[PDB]
Amino acid sequence: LQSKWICLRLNDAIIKRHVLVLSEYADLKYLGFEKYKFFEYVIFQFCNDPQLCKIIENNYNYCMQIFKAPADDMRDIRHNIKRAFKTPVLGHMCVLSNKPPMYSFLKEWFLLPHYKVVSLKSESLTWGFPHVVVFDLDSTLITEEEQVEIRDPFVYDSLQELHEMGCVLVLWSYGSRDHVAHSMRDVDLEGYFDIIISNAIVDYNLKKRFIENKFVFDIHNHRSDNNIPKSPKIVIKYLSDKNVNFFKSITLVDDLPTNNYAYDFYVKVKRCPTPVQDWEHYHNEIIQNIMDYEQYFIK
Amino acid sequence: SLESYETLKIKLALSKYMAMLSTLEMTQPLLEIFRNKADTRQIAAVVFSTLAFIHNRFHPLVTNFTNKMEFVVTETNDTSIPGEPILFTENEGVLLCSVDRPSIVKMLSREFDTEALVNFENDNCNVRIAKTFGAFSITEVEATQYLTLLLTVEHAYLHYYIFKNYGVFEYCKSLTDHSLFTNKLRKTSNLLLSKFKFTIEDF
């Protein structure tokens, strides 16, 4: 499914680290004046037109580069663009709502109506451009047994290290909101997590913890986990809700590799129903992945 | 006791800032330096050294720092922003640092409530009596002024870091809204602004 495509970096932009999807290079007309400046990165599939390439290179406002990627994942596309322009970080993903470019690459990764860029709130929670990690509570951080418990109390230390370095903490466990909330309360994690996934929740013990799963779209022509194999789109949307419109890389840590929708990194852990000292090794793996990303963009 | 140890650490950080000031080797106190408009070079050097000191603290592993910066000491009201005595603009690739010298002078000249307030301290009359029977300096006001300037430049340096890391757009947006750094430490620990809290209430 190797597909050729073009990417352009604006040589003088107002909004940085933001990418816009176009069905073709000609879509720039839809931006016209004082809109292109808000998308310093432009991505669009390539139609093998040398005259189009000539036009693009003549467009001195843009630095062009061509790369190929499978037509099924933002991961390869984003890796290619980020290595091309040496940008470890990505801004909010924008699309031309007037002319939605239907690329199978996306299929529920993330997006935004282009015109909403200016409305974005730059202020965020963590200084710099933190990483993001999503944890599937069930048997990943706790014990699958009924009387759930932290499989390895080193979980607290690992989360504190994540926070100290700077990295958004997200939970997505495919259980009842009440189940996950009470699991947090029992294992005394609670405040560790920036985002929680399973009007948010009201029990007189919590104010707002589980953003209501209002977004429903079934599947994008893929037979898999009934609910979903997790949702980069939903998690990044909640990041933006939490004022996080930038991130360095995203890692999904869970007890089930099947979900693994599209994440810059993934970590699998045992479906262990009883406590065991292994989360230190899992934390070692996660920090190794983070360091690997840091190596990819060490220069 | 413990809190006293953190107090000692904070005072040590202030003392390090004092070492930086001595390295600068200014004849006059910062109050007089700021009062003297002609000392534009001294003011710029003070600001730059404070910024580098804060950068080293905020990034202990990083010793590098911008070794050249355009500076402009502003005096007119229209050349200053309330609540941001220090600003970091860009003149099309040129990094300009604007300074509100009148505001700095005003803050420094403000009388401090050193004696006026009474606060809890290590106070044991028995120890005092036992001691009695067994038997270049900085004032509290100067220390307060110096802390005020350090914290001002800390705010300015945080805005500058937003500017460099994110860009001029986000720097302006931060100037408008400061909510980005309610969390602060999330590096930051070495910044005194992360050591206390200040609030305003309707009354």
Binding site: - | D177, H178, K197
Partner: peptide, 22 residues
């Protein structure tokens, strides 16, 4: 002096410190 409105909550945010859980 500038006759500009003041954002009390934003000033509080300037000097706002979050507290961790440990």
């Amino acid at each position: 002096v500038s006759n500009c409105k003041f954002n009390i909550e934003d000033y509080n945010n300037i000097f706002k410190v979050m507290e961790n859980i440990r």
